[PDB]
Design a protein around this ligand. Sequence first.
Ligand SMILES: Nc1nc2c(ncn2[C@@H]2O[C@H](COP(=O)(O)OP(=O)(O)OP(=O)(O)O)[C@@H](O)[C@H]2O)c(=O)[nH]1
Ligand SMILES: [Mg+2]
Ligand SMILES: [Mg+2]
Lengths: 337, 49, 144, 69, 49, 145, 136, 48, 145
Amino acid sequence: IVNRYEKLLSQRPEWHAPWKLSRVINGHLGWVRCVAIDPVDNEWFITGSNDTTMKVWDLATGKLKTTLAGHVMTVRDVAVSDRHPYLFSVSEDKTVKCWDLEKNQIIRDYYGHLSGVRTVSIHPTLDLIATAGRDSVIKLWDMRTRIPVITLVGHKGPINQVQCTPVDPQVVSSSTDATVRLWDVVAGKTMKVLTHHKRSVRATALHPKEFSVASACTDDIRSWGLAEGSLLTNFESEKTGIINTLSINQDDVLFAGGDNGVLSFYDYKSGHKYQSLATREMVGSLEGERSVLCSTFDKTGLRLITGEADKSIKIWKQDETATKESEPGLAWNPNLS
Amino acid sequence: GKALNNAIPGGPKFEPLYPREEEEDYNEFNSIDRVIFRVPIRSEYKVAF
Amino acid sequence: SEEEIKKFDSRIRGILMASGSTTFTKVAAKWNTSLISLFTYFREAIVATEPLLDILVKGETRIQNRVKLGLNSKMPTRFPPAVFYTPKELGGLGMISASHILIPASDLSWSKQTDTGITHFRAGMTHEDEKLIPTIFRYITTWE
Amino acid sequence: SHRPQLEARSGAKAAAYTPTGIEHARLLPGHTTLKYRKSWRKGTAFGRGYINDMTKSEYHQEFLHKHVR
Amino acid sequence: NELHPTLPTNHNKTKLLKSLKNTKYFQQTTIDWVEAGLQLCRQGHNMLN
Amino acid sequence: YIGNLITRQFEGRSNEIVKTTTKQRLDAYYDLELRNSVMDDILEMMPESIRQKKARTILQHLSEAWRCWKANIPWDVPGMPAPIKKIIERYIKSKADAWVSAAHYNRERIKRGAHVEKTMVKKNLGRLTRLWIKNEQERQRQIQK
Amino acid sequence: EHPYGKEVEVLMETKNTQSPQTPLVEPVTERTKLQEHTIFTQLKKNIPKTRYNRDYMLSMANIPERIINVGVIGPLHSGKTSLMDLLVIDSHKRIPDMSKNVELGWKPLRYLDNLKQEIDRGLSIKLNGSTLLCTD
Amino acid sequence: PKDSRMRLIRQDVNLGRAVFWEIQSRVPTSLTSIKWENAFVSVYSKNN
Amino acid sequence: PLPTKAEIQECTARTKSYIQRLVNAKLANSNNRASSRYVAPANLLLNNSHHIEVVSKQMDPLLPRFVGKKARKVVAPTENDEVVPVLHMGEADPNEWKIPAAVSNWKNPNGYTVALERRVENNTINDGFMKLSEALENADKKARQ
RNA sequence: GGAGGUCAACAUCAAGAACUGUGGGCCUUUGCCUAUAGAACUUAUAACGAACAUGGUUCUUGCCUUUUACCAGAAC
Ligand SMILES: Nc1nc2c(ncn2[C@@H]2O[C@H](COP(=O)(O)OP(=O)(O)OP(=O)(O)O)[C@@H](O)[C@H]2O)c(=O)[nH]1
Ligand SMILES: [Mg+2]
Ligand SMILES: [Mg+2]
């Protein structure tokens, strides 16, 4: 098996630059559960909360534009549409609510989940919604007629994170039974199963280019090729548990938010971890409240936005000095698995 | 009549359509000392022009 | 003063929420023992305040509307004021109505400034046939 | 015999039942068209900021300092 | 009723009866009006029973 | 209507009948999502084996820590792995913040006196007396120190 | 503040900028709608067809003696504008503004009115002319 | 109403906050707390 | 490789058509003469010898359409064709991670009787008290003298 | 072949003050410019109806133990 270990010593992967802390934005009353960014102009955020609201923050200066109320309970997920001026928010109240960005009033309510719905993802080309939650089923909603067109029977437990892809498998799903399924929706059954995770897969992210996915677990962040469904790579992780979210820059940088408050940055190609940071909790907070609930990159990918459990949004910027003087991180030493 | 929350002595009575008049900035502009009272300014004016 | 206006209003709300069904004469008795307190203490001042007049009206009309719910109705025709205001010795509730009067309405925009006087009267409380009813503040001598 | 729950109902069950066909109130067609993007003083006795917590904040002690009288 | 118009429903051109009469199961005739009133009362009473 | 009445009269009422959250059953759901959310974490911190016994046990420790937070009692457990205590402190801090904010909101909804239910007045009263005594004990301790 | 203190912008935001009614995503209006302020025809192909051949009219402009400027003035509701209506709809062959109603009209077609405010106000406000050739 | 309320004039206001400032000083903040928020000051002068 | 372009214009086409088939299949089902405005022999049987022609029958509008649709509940089987191998890559740990029992003052629903010590401060005063008591003491003496 | 019908089907009926076809030129089909022919029905105190109902969501209220049923304004 050593031949593989030599083949890990030839590459010397992929230098990148570190990250640092540009800006701190308070202003939520409760926790920040979810964050999404305007896919076109990059001019703002939509941030869920634990206070039921949604507060639309300006990306440029960080000022607060507007407040979108209307959920009775905490908002687990928010997703903004590309081709549409629509905003689909979803909560623990068992409802997926549409939002017309133009006039800022609820348009449609989609009905028929048994219990809280923790993920919405907007299929790129079909005018569909994909919702999922403690139902343990994935519902493909027809955006126009509010008809739960397709239901995907599936994982043996709740469904944490769901994504959409234009070609085959059009829905990737991740559940607390510690599997990740690659779905074929037209026939309505699993195309491929990926079991390699040992515990709940709490987050996924789609690489904007290579047509792959990064899947998470407690201590091990893996990657997966879509299409064939192979494993692609691994990412070197000592115990980071727990991984709340992942985000993939367009430069092939793979972010990992910790529940220990550590921000684990990776290269996507290699699996190498070139940086790990630690956030400052807050003025009056508790050391338990330091963690990262969600995160995203803008359309460019030169800034990072992380909602934290301390009731604050933080904006992490990529250092411009860097280069070879001293960037170098942990420097690519891998222990035998 | 409706939008301005006014009635013609024989016309209908509606709701305000802008329920809050309560906000008033204390300011010199409309102060009595600066106003000349000629003619009462009946409603029928306010509905007319 | 505004505070003790709000204290009175809050107390009426107290009588209302406290008694789900106490029957009837208990309610009229409580409201009597409240109002008589308010007047007897505030006697002279009450004349000059718009909000406390409005709140007396809403208060009494609200309690009458509570006995009306006590059967089923809001209906005006069923309950002419003889029903409420005849003393117990004749078999009526015997409540003491201070809310009829007429309420000075003058000039919302100006009365913020001059104290124009009383230029107009809004109708305080209503009826099918008017009759009239005496109101407490007439039967209690002013403080001066 | 009240219990927490230790599970949820998997929607798979409801997926195998047959539809009833009752017509609800909120599923009547509405918003049917999408939208696309493009000397007196001398006698006196005496001479002359964000905390994160709910209870210890300032607004709170204002609140309870008032509504308790 | 002047302030909130309606602007009804193109494609409404299909009516209950124009769809209904088509079928085998409905037949057309004339009749006295009061007789139609009485029949319809008998209809209803059987329905609710 | 009669469409539903009759089709329901032949075909029986729908078997699914999911039921939405509204004003009455809200708090129940909030509890439920919470206890679930703690189940996940405290299952994912532990190294491998044990589940159901330690499930019930740990969730009991949750409830107890909440009650002791209402009572201002500090809730020290003579022993318990510290990271779990981090987690439970976190979630009960959350629930605490939401609870307080509901107390303020309902109060300033009552001061205006618009459509508050007969009970919400009583409940809100309760939450306010709890919070007020907490402010008191805080003041006294900080006077000692 | 001090936990960061140097580069980091510590900002506590409440209330709002951008009052909530604002669109937050601007509706794209591709065509430009004038019909709110005035009522005025913008295309080259919809201008009425002037049975007298406009081209031949513009030739008259070379002869200074030939063209004349007449204004029309008179007190309220003397019929000015509805007179210019008679002249116009005599000259032009097909006007898009005629409803079948006003063509036989119970309600006078008022061509030179042209402003929304002057339509609803029932009056004429800003002066408006026309140019046309007509046979003596 | 505004007219018969207390007028706001520099002499007046400055007198008011002056008085309240001194008596504010006399009592120690330890015994009690006298805040300008709760207080009311009235001034009768040539202009009021 | 990302999935080209003319590849997605296919999956989008066929999927889009299929979803339209489901939606239109539904809108004609339910009870609304209103909802229908938003919307072949085909049988070679056996050897095709006798062919076939299929023709629908118009239902009597009053009588129930779908005479057999009646709400009833079904348990579905799970037909397991193949097994998905679940392929993954303490000792002293329990002494860290062992959860104690949960015992509350407030509730003993079962009736478990447990010792009183399962049911059942450091800092001293400040020198301020010393100073204050001494000042009042002395000034008191002075005044009295 | 004319008159009709308490007959049917299929089109069309709210918009750059606005429809469609065609000829010619430029870009490279779209689109812009230019030339020409025909425009039923509905529209300016704006609309197919010289009339006038109900429902859903979201806010503001009003009744006021709670839910249907409701009170009267707004937006979609
Ligand atoms: N009987 C009668 N009435 C007319 C005649 N001409 C116009 N009117 C009425 O008089 C009113 C005035 O007609 P307009 O020409 O539209 O009004 P106008 O001349 O523009 O009045 P101004 O706006 O002041 O210029 C209209 O409402 C017409 O109904 C007419 O020849 N005979
Ligand atoms: Mg004119
Ligand atoms: Mg109940």
